[PDB]
Design an enzyme around this catalytic site. Structure first.
Site, PDB file in Angstrom:
ATOM      1  N   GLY A  64       2.933   6.498   8.986  1.00  0.00           N
ATOM      2  CA  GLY A  64       4.266   6.272   8.472  1.00  0.00           C
ATOM      3  C   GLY A  64       5.021   5.133   9.121  1.00  0.00           C
TER       4      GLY A  64
ATOM      5  N   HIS B 224       0.814  -1.218   0.000  1.00  0.00           N
ATOM      6  CA  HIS B 224       0.000   0.000   0.000  1.00  0.00           C
ATOM      7  C   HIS B 224       0.856   1.281   0.000  1.00  0.00           C
ATOM      8  CE1 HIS B 224       0.423   1.246   4.208  1.00  0.00           C
ATOM      9  NE2 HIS B 224      -0.113   0.136   4.683  1.00  0.00           N
TER      10      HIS B 224
ATOM     11  N   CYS C 206       4.138   2.043   9.009  1.00  0.00           N
ATOM     12  CA  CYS C 206       3.988   0.845   8.199  1.00  0.00           C
ATOM     13  C   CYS C 206       5.328   0.435   7.613  1.00  0.00           C
ATOM     14  CB  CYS C 206       2.977   1.098   7.083  1.00  0.00           C
ATOM     15  SG  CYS C 206       1.743   2.378   7.479  1.00  0.00           S
TER      16      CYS C 206
HETATM   17  C1  LIG Z   1      -1.378   2.467   8.310  1.00  0.00           C
HETATM   18  C2  LIG Z   1      -0.160   2.786   9.177  1.00  0.00           C
HETATM   19  C3  LIG Z   1       0.927   1.741   8.911  1.00  0.00           C
HETATM   20  C4  LIG Z   1      -0.570   2.812  10.649  1.00  0.00           C
HETATM   21  O1  LIG Z   1      -0.411   1.859  11.332  1.00  0.00           O
HETATM   22  C5  LIG Z   1      -1.163   4.094  11.233  1.00  0.00           C
HETATM   23  C6  LIG Z   1      -1.513   5.256  10.307  1.00  0.00           C
HETATM   24  C7  LIG Z   1      -2.018   6.368  10.803  1.00  0.00           C
HETATM   25  C8  LIG Z   1      -2.260   6.496  12.302  1.00  0.00           C
HETATM   26  C9  LIG Z   1      -2.842   7.784  12.879  1.00  0.00           C
HETATM   27  C10 LIG Z   1      -1.963   5.493  13.104  1.00  0.00           C
HETATM   28  C11 LIG Z   1      -1.373   4.207  12.529  1.00  0.00           C
END
Ligand SMILES: *C[C@@H](C)C(=O)c1ccc(C)cc1
Ligand SMILES: *C[C@@H](C)C(=O)c1ccc(C)cc1
Ligand SMILES: [Cl-]
Lengths: 305, 305
Positions: free
Chosen positions: A143, A41, A145
């Site tokens: 970020g 993604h 991820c």
């Molecule tokens: C999707 C991303 C890896 C994730 O784990 C995430 C994204 C945005 C927030 C506020 C918290 C966690």
């Protein structure tokens, strides 16, 4: 003495973390040999996350669209491919800091350390467990991820998790390093809810053994039980069923303490039926279940890497 | 979201850990530039630990008696000296992996990460706090002495602790990197008991703010209080007195959540007076006090190194 939620030393993994930018999205990647692994993604826009056709979205991307930065130096991408829910970016330089490693798909109840990273830079390290509902209870922000979970075996880093998604309930979902999600979760912003967060019984028992080793013994009682009797209690309290395999795994901790596994089950049974009565065990006021039997032996012995 | 007891990435410190052997004793040392720091009791026999005259014991030692091993390669010792309760071993090679660093003496209530090592090899990493009684609640076994505690500031490792002793109560005592013990403890096997383990109030409040940020809010109430009224309650429950300096330090967390510091004190007051009633906050059934305000902001934002 003393018992702490302990992570593995993170240096070996720190040397593998890179930044991956596709368009305006910036995630973390894992650089091993001449391949960089990251969540697929990375190619999605925030809008796309509702119903992405990753195969179609990828057709619009070329090697030069994936910007990979190790520290301050850019890496040259010479190929890319999708494997399940991860992308494999082939670069022209092997990571000189690559450790001996393996990819492992762990089972619910197993523990691992997570190196939380942002923009390819490590932020902190903590210990987790694959929950019986195939979520993990992590600490992740935008970020993060591509941050990975791992175990270490003297010289071999076993990678078991890469972070992808946060559920609306604030728990976390991700893949093994072959890109296959743990549990039924998908890299789509949709209605996916976690199942029952059951307690990992064999880990609770290991932690009770850890307590006895380290001085905490007020919960030992004069009783015993049987596997079938105990499991009747485990069910009422949303605990994993305890098996003979679990009993066998606790053998070494039973030997080191002289407390039969089924005697400890009877102690746990009383704690479930009567609570802690305002007392604590190893500095906790609840029954901890993210220490495995092997974790307890390791910390109480001093195994190094 | 999610909030975890998080340590700093340990790689920078891993590269500094060496083994120090004097006679038959083997501890850990810290290799920075061309100096190796270790506990002076590396020179003691187990018998000596009752009443050692370190100055006299050192007279019998020469440079070649201190065997220093970085991984599998031996380092050449070209000088040695005692500074307070640590030894400084001058070696002929600067550590190529030396990070930017400083030595800091921390205050009670401050937190740091510990890299537990044995025979100069890292075993695990966990987060600690200097307790108000100047002990720390660590996880240490034989040979762990010389393991260090630290904080990281993007690129600068601030070393604040080196491990020396386990008290009969299973808590731990050590020095700053200038060899001065925290608290009244001495590197002698004697009758030294720890004082009251009071709770670090400002850290509890920071952690309650962390909970509100991460979804846990059942403990918020309709009340407020004053510093003097609250501190009357803090005293009955063996809590640190809360000062205006502490209030000022919580300012940013109060702004991010819109909950006045004194309103949160009133929530903590009710939790002290009435307990948790079987509920949990951020997965704990007690009031956690080893997260500082800066720790909470750091984890809830994503600061990297
Ligand atoms: C999707 C991303 C890896 C994730 O784990 C995430 C994204 C945005 C927030 C506020 C918290 C966690
Ligand atoms: C004294 C040494 C550094 C230490 O902390 C220790 C030694 C021996 C045991 C069993 C536990 C801890
Ligand atoms: Cl708890």
């Amino acid at each position: 003495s003393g018992f702490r939620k302990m992570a593995f030393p993170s240096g070996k993994v720190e040397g593998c973390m890179v930044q991956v930018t596709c368009g305006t999205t910036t995630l973390n990647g894992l650089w091993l040999d001449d391949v960089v692994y990251c969540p697929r993604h990375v190619i999605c826009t925030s809008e796309d996350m509702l119903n992405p056709n990753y195969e179609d979205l990828l057709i619009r991307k070329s090697n030069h669209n994936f910007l990979v930065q190790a520290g301050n130096v850019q890496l040259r991408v010479i190929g890319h491919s999708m494997q399940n829910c991860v992308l494999k970016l082939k670069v022209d330089t092997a990571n000189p800091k690559t450790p001996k490693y393996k990819f492992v798909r762990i089972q619910p109840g197993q523990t691992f350390s997570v190196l939380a990273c942002y923009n390819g830079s490590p932020s902190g390290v903590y210990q987790c467990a694959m929950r019986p509902n195939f979520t993990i209870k992590g600490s992740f922000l935008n970020g993060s991820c591509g941050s990975v979970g791992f175990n270490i075996d003297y010289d071999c880093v076993s990678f078991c998790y890469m972070h992808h998604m946060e559920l609306p309930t604030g728990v976390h979902a991700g893949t093994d390093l072959e890109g296959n999600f743990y549990g039924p979760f998908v890299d789509r912003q949709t209605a996916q809810a976690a199942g029952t967060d059951t307690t990992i019984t064999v880990n609770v028992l290991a932690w009770l053994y850890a307590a006895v080793i380290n001085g905490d013994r007020w919960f030992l009682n004069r009783f015993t039980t049987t596997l079938n009797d105990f499991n009747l209690v485990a069910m009422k309290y949303n605990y994993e069923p305890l098996t003979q395999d679990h009993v066998d795994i606790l053998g070494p901790l039973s030997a080191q303490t002289g407390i039969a596994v089924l005697d400890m089950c009877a102690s746990l049974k009383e704690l479930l039926q009567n609570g802690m009565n305002g007392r604590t065990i190893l500095g906790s006021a609840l029954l901890e279940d993210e220490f495995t039997p092997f974790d307890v032996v390791r910390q109480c012995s001093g195994v190094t890497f």
